[PDB]
Design a binder for this molecule. Structure first.
Ligand SMILES: Nc1ncnc2c1ncn2[C@@H]1O[C@H](COP(=O)(O)OP(=O)(O)O)[C@@H](O)[C@H]1O
Ligand SMILES: [Mg+2]
Ligand SMILES: [Zn+2]
Ligand SMILES: [Zn+2]
Lengths: 565, 623
DNA sequence: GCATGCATGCGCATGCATGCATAATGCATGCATGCGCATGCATGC
């Protein structure tokens, strides 16, 4: 064991030392600038990398890994001691909490002489005056672990995990230190909290009440108290790491002030945390002794082009898929044996926000939302808000699910009115559907693609060659960039000029006239014109042009013609 | 003291500031539109105090933005520390009131109530920095509990010598004397509840309607606590604005122990209620009061009503972004005006439905859904249901138990929240027979009867229905008749006042106009005031000429609808004609229904069903 | 495809074995010392 004073001094010198890294290509005092910002209310939390510390001392890193909480507290105290040195000016604008801190420090200077004896209980709690939080970043050398294998050997260690989010709690304030005022004195009493539950005090420990033996009684205050942001997270294993025949395991995470509001249900996250237990008191058990429940305390959470190049053919369908991803509802009907499911899988993997449903497995409560112990939790349609949703084997779905899907496509909101639930849910998502061989699809959807397997010898032979190549060389014959391109594209919004309207109008009229000439035609309406306008706007957005052009309209017309034929 | 601990507030400085501001403030931008009944050239708040002296209401309402306009320090100090600021404002106002108007009789002194704090933020964006600060809310009330009495001053009696004392609550706790005051006996003082003083409390649950919405956020429920006169100022289904403080309370581990949990609860302490809104129509609360001080607007609207085309103009002004379908918009306007609410209790017949139910049947590739969306967003007390998403118990009311208290026996559903409002039903075909059974009684009797275990009650459901439907094949197949295309029982169909058969004529002029309008897509207040005035100031009545015209229309309708293939007529269509005639009479601001109104109602009834173009002996629509 | 049957499913009440919380007073014993007694030593005359 080593004395904490020496390591505290080492921490202080490490914070004062580093000059190395700068983004603009120079040598910049990073931690000094961070501390100067911390001096005032220009930064309310600080993150420390354990890769930068590894340059000078690895034993510090190991001791931090095995005894993380103590080192977190030591770091907090060291930074708090360093703060007065770097301070250069008073606060330009301050809020209520700063007003208490300043007033308390001012009267502490007013009253306390340097020589008088002060009881250990007479000091201010450290965390009450402090207003900055310290968190750690996991070592790059350290390998992320699996939820299944963290056990009693890992209690108290520093770990890094990767998982899928399933449950998130709404933000609520959590008590840190409670403040009490006596009934017959001007003194203030502070009660730190480090337990799930606590018992409020009654009598006043202040010196004046003790000397007079007045028996004054304490009262809580909320303004003087310190509160923090608190969230609760549920994570599960990836399907890849589950052993044979088992079921994914779950873990619970707790989230602090600035880390709050980072993750959403359904996201894949990487969490740097400390593995700590909770002493459990409750119903009696078989085995005597001290049992506990484990949980994780987080300190950092981190979340034309070729589309599905493995699948041969369907180039126009791929262009339509690109347009749907870029944005301004697509349905595919095909014979069995044509890979429609794999296109939907690729779409789900590519999209940032996406969901993929297979049929009756996610039917009913899997869609819409339900009430659970009370909080309302949404289904796939709710999760895919402002994303893209994918549905396979559409015709096999129950009628209620199809009605809900139609409502989402047309109205873009869901309405639920049943015993215990009365809500309207926002679902601004575009739908891609797959099915096997109706007027509803033609009337409601925007674009339908019919894939018929005509046994042409040349096409079949080329498909066979491509499949053999894929199976043998495990690569197509000769996503991050695509995601970045789509993100940059969606930033702009082109506009339709006044003149082109006439041209568009003419086209529409002529199209309808042809549809009226061909009595075998089925649907033309203003919805088709709206779809054409949306496709042209999407193409103009792809060109990053401010004004809609002729080529976009021609390509949209050609795509609609190809789909209809 | 110069400043208060934990703050920067000075009492005397703020008192003088408020007293000066109550006499100095003048704003030129606030015209007669909102500076209503007040001489603008004079200071506003002093005139408000004078009006209070005239009426004697012990409460004054203050807009925050006016105070911010006067100065920023007072605004920030009022927002940050309401507790140290409002009591100063009370006495600052009271001194001025008593000085300027001496010996005016009041039961208690003046209390000031701020309102309209500029916050357009999502409630989930709140932070601990904002605990105990003044915030605004826009929402809809869904649950209100019963009143709770909470003590303010306790009464004690000596069990030995009948000596009685009163103890005032301080810091939320009552300290009962342990020794008497005349016999000095210890612990002889007993507490008597009925002799004490109590105050009213109410808990309200509100549903959020945020302006800004992130991705994938579920709806929210907010808990509000209302005290004293604020009780019973809102009802379920009402859309209101609320101004109040944001609080935090600890939670016990279990009711039998005093331990508390570390994670705190939260709620909001209501200070002010507001009903006005600049997007939706006026509610029934303001209509029942004489607040039409704007005689200029009254004269303007009464002069407008005499112009001939105003009817069409209203049909034009109901929806600027909607297409040439003027008949549909006229029907919706007549629905908005509604028929006269006569009283027939002395007759023994029961309630008579005075509202208008409309049906729109057509292909999905039309704009009926947009019309339903616009009507939902335009009228207060609006609800929207779609197809199989709702159940029979989801409507009307359902049995519950409180998650916070012991019981809440019954909770209202979609239809009851729509009382005196509008309910828009979409995908009416997919609804099962179980829910249509409820609709059968709702659409006619205006009441609901519920009889379950320990729960027998009758509720009011005075709603108006806008229903949308599709053809069975999703196409209007011309070979099949109208009844075969719709596929609904005649009992359900007969109760609809108007039925709109949307059909596609494929006219070139229609295509050109719609294309030009849609591509080119790339006074509301006057309408609101006119609608409110007409809806709240005139009772239509009809003479014998209208009576005989209605009878002739009824027999003609029976003659026309006798032939099979078309929708047959029933006696309820006569009442539908009466309601439409009364609505049209309301449009013209006329207390007397003329034959013009009856003829217009007949014209709308004939045109809605397209009976002119329809072949009377085959039931097939032609062009 | 629509009308009906129905095996599954959920939330709050009571009944019953284990388990949890409470909580000074009266009587006895050995050390210190007074009071009566007989032996015995030392001191006169
Ligand atoms: N154009 C194609 N290119 C490559 N492989 C294909 C193609 N079409 C079909 N396949 C193969 O055939 C299989 C089709 O199965 P699946 O996509 O599940 O059919 P469906 O989606 O109709 O149920 C896939 O495993 C895929 O590998
Ligand atoms: Mg498939
Ligand atoms: Zn004290
Ligand atoms: Zn007494």
């Amino acid at each position: 064991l080593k004395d904490y004073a020496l390591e505290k001094e080492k921490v202080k010198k490490f914070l004062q030392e580093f000059y190395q890294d700068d983004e603009l290509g120079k040598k910049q005092f990073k931690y000094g600038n961070q501390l100067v910002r911390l001096a005032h209310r220009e930064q309310v939390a600080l993150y420390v990398d354990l890769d930068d510390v590894a340059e000078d001392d690895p034993e510090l890193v190991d001791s931090i890994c095995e005894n993380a909480r103590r080192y977190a507290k030591l770091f907090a105290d060291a930074v708090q001691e360093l703060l007065p040195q770097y301070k250069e000016r008073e606060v330009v604008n301050k809020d209520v909490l700063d007003v208490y801190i300043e007033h308390r420090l001012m009267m502490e200077q007013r009253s306390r002489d340097p020589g008088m004896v002060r009881s250990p209980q007479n000091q201010y709690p450290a965390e009450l005056m402090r207003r900055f939080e310290l968190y750690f970043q996991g070592p790059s050398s350290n390998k992320p672990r699996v939820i299944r294998e963290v056990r009693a050997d890992s209690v108290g260690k520093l770990v890094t995990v990767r998982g899928i989010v399933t449950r998130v709690s709404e933000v609520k304030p959590k008590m840190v230190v409670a403040t009490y005022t006596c009934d017959q004195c001007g003194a203030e009493t502070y009660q730190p909290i480090q337990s799930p539950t606590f018992m409020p005090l009654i009598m006043c420990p202040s010196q004046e009440c003790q000397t007079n033996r007045s028996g004054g009684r304490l009262y809580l205050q909320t303004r003087g108290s310190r509160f923090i942001k608190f969230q609760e997270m549920k994570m599960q294993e990836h399907s890849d790491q589950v052993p044979v025949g088992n079921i994914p395991r779950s873990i619970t995470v707790l989230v602090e002030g600035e880390n709050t509001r980072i993750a959403q249900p359904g996201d894949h996250v990487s969490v740097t945390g400390i593995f700590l237990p909770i002493l459990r008191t409750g119903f009696r058990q078989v085995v005597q002794g001290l049992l506990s429940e484990t949980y994780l305390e987080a300190h950092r959470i981190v979340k034309a082009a070729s589309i599905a190049p493995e699948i041969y053919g369907h180039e126009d369908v791929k262009k339509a898929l690109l347009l749907l991803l870029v944005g301004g509802n697509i349905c595919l009907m095909g014979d069995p044996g044509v890979a429609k499911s794999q296109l939907l899988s690729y779409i789900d993997r590519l999209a940032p926000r996406s969901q993929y449903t297979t049929g009756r497995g996610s039917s009913g409560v899997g869609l819409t939302a339900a009430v659970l112990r009370l909080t309302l939790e949404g289904g796939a349609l709710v999760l895919a808000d402002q994303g893209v949703c994918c549905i396979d084997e559409f015709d096999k779905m129950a009628e209620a699910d199809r009605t809900a899907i139609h409502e989402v496509m047309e109205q873009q909101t869901i309405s639920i009115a049943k015993a215990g639930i009365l809500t309207t849910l926002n679902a601004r998502c575009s739908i891609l559907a797959a099915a096997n061989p109706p007027a509803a699809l033609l009337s409601r959807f925007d674009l339908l693609w019919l894939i018929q397997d005509r046994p042409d010898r040349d096409n079949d032979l080329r498909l066979a060659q491509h499949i053999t190549y894929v199976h043998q060389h495990s690569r197509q014959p000769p996503m991050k960039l695509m995601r970045r391109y789509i993100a940059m594209c969606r930033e702009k919004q082109p506009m339709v000029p006044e003149s082109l309207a006439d041209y568009i109008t003419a086209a529409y009229v002529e199209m309808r006239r042809e549809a009226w000439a061909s009595k075998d035609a089925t649907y033309t309406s203003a919805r088709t014109l709206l779809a054409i306008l949306r496709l042209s706007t999407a193409l103009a957005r792809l060109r990053m042009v401010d004004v809609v052009e002729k080529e976009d309209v021609n390509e949209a017309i050609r795509l609609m013609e190809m789909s209809k034929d | 003291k110069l400043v208060i601990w934990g703050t920067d507030v000075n009492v005397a400085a703020c008192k003088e500031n408020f007293q000066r501001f109550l006499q100095r403030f003048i704003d030129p931008l606030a015209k007669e539109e909102e500076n209503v009944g007040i001489d603008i050239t004079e200071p506003l708040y002093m005139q408000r105090l004078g009006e209070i002296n005239v009426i004697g209401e012990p409460f004054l309402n203050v807009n925050c933005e006016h105070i911010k306009s006067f100065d920023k320090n007072l605004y920030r100090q009022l927002i940050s520390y309401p507790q140290e600021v409002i009591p100063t404002f009370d006495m600052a106002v009271n001194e001025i009131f008593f000085d300027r108007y001496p010996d005016s009789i009041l039961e208690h002194q003046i209390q000031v109530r701020p309102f309209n704090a500029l916050k357009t933020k999502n409630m989930r964006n709140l932070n601990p920095e904002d605990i105990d600060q003044l915030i605004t809310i826009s929402g809809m009330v869904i649950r209100t509990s019963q009143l709770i009495p909470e003590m303010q001053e306790a009464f004690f009696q000596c069990q030995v010598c009948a000596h009685t004392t009163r103890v005032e609550m301080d810091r939320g706790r009552i300290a009962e004397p342990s020794v008497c005051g005349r016999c000095h006996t210890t612990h002889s003082m007993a507490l008597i509840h009925n002799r004490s003083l109590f105050s009213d409390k109410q808990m309200i649950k509100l549903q959020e309607s945020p302006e800004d919405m992130p991705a994938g956020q579920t709806p929210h429920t907010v808990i509000l606590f209302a005290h004293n006169d604020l009780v019973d100022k809102v009802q379920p289904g009402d859309r209101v604005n609320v101004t109040g403080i944001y609080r935090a309370v600890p939670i016990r581990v279990n009711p039998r122990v005093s331990n508390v949990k570390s994670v705190y609860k939260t709620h909001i302490d209501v200070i002010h209620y507001r009903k006005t809104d600049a997007k939706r129509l006026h509610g029934l609360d303001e209509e029942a009061e004489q607040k039409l001080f704007s005689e200029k607007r009254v004269e303007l609207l009464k002069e407008l009503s005499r112009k001939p085309d105003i009817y069409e103009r209203l049909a034009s002004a109901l929806a600027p972004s909607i297409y040439e379908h003027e008949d549909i918009k006229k029907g919706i306007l007549l629905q908005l005006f509604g028929g006269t609410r006569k009283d027939f209790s002395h007759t023994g017949r029961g309630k008579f439905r005075a509202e208008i139910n409309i049906l729109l049947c057509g292909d999905p590739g039309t704009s009926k859904s947009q019309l339903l969306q616009y009507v939902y967003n335009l009228v207060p007390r609006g609800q929207y249901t779609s197809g199989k998403g709702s159940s029979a118990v989801g409507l009307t009311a359902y049995v519950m138990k409180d998650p916070e208290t012991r019981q809440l026996v019954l909770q209202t559903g979609a239809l009851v929240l729509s009382d005196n409002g509008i309910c828009c039903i979409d995908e009416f075909d997919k609804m099962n027979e179980s829910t249509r059974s409820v609709l059968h009684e709702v659409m006619e009797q205006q009441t609901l009867s519920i009889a379950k275990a320990g729960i027998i009650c009758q509720l009011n459901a005075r709603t108006s229905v806008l229903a949308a439907a599709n053809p069975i094949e999703s196409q209007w197949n011309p070979k099949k008749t109208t009844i075969e295309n719709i596929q609904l029982p005649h009992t359900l169909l007969s109760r609809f006042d108007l039925i709109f058969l949307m059909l596609d004529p494929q006219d070139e002029a229609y295509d050109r106009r719609l294309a030009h309008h849609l591509v080119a897509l790339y006074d509301m207040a006057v309408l609101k005031d006119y609608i409110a005035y007409a809806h709240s100031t005139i009772m239509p009545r009809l003479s014998e000429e209208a009576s005989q015209a209605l009878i002739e229309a009824y027999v003609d309708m029976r003659k026309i609808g006798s032939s099979r293939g078309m929708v047959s007529a029933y006696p309820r269509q006569l009442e539908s004609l009466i309601r439409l005639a009364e609505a049209h009479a309301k449009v013209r601001l006329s207390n007397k229904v003329e034959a013009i109104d009856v003829e217009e109602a007949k014209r709308l009834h004939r045109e809605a069903l397209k009976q002119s173009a329809t072949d009377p002996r085959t039931g097939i629509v032609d062009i």
